[PDB]
Amino acid sequence: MSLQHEKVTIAPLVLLSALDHYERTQTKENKRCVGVILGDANSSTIRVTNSFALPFEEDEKNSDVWFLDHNYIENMNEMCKKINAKEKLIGWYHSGPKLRASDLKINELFKKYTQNNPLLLIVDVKQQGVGLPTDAYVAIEQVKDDGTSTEK
């Protein structure tokens, strides 16, 4: 759709929250957590106000196999709409630790809900490095000089 994710400003609340969800589903041993990010978009700064957990069970045989409830997402969104109505789907968080290429397929699913281009916010739960524990990424489509067609 667009690129307008030049800056991502992220509330400290969200980080705190992400660690809290991660432990209370007790995803350890290379298990992941996905939740929705709620917040503003159509701004060059993307504002991450809030997050909420989605139930997501991620497999150990493959990384290509996952369960995620689509029915759940809307219910969560409409209750939060009642609180403050400036909150809309702006992506989903991955609990890291690191980027995956099975996240690309999940990105495309969140692209339905959005009216912006999905933010994948790898919120590390490992607190690695003395700098930020967040790297941010957005799935964008390109051709490239190599002879590489339609790359995501």
Binding site: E6, N42, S43, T45, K86
Partner: protein, 158 residues
């Protein structure tokens, strides 16, 4: 009917009309799926109407301030990519970032003026730049329109 009658005994053979009827059984099967779908969708929809409007109905009941409207000065409506205001701001890419929709400035009888984003249910056809409005006293949003004020001695003329 313009098919399958005594018009078509003349026009076509009646075993072709025997097989026609068993294809209208096939097409009303497809259509029957499609009607039940659209009922179900309207069952989800009516309760999303109910959800919004109950909120408005708490705000609607008593008490609420009574004020006049300074002016409607508006701001460009929300549909743009860079801002949606009439007055130029610093920086690029906005639409809800500090950008705001139409504006109504209202003057209280508590003696102040408040720049509020006007209620999207109350029109500009229901605002005149002197109109006597309700304002919700807890958080300043134009609640309703009411008719122009009259002093008690003018009520006593009638």
């Amino acid at each position: 009917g313009d098919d399958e009658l005594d018009q078509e005994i003349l026009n076509l053979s009646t075993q072709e009309l025997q097989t026609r009827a068993k294809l209208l059984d096939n097409e009303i099967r497809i259509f029957r799926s499609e009607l039940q779908r659209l009922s179900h969708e309207n069952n989800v929809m009516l309760e999303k109407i109910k959800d919004n409007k109950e909120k408005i109905k708490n705000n609607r009941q008593l008490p609420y301030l009574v004020a006049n409207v300074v002016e409607v000065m508006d701001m460009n409506e929300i549909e743009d990519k860079e801002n949606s205001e009439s007055t130029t701001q610093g920086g690029n890419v906005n639409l809800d970032n500090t950008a705001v929709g139409k504006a109504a400035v209202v003057k209280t009888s508590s003696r102040q003026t408040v720049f509020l984003p006007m209620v999207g249910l109350v029109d500009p056809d229901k605002l005149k730049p002197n109109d006597l409005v309700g304002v919700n006293k807890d958080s300043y949003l134009i609640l309703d329109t009411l008719p122009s004020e009259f002093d008690s001695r003018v009520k006593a003329m009638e």
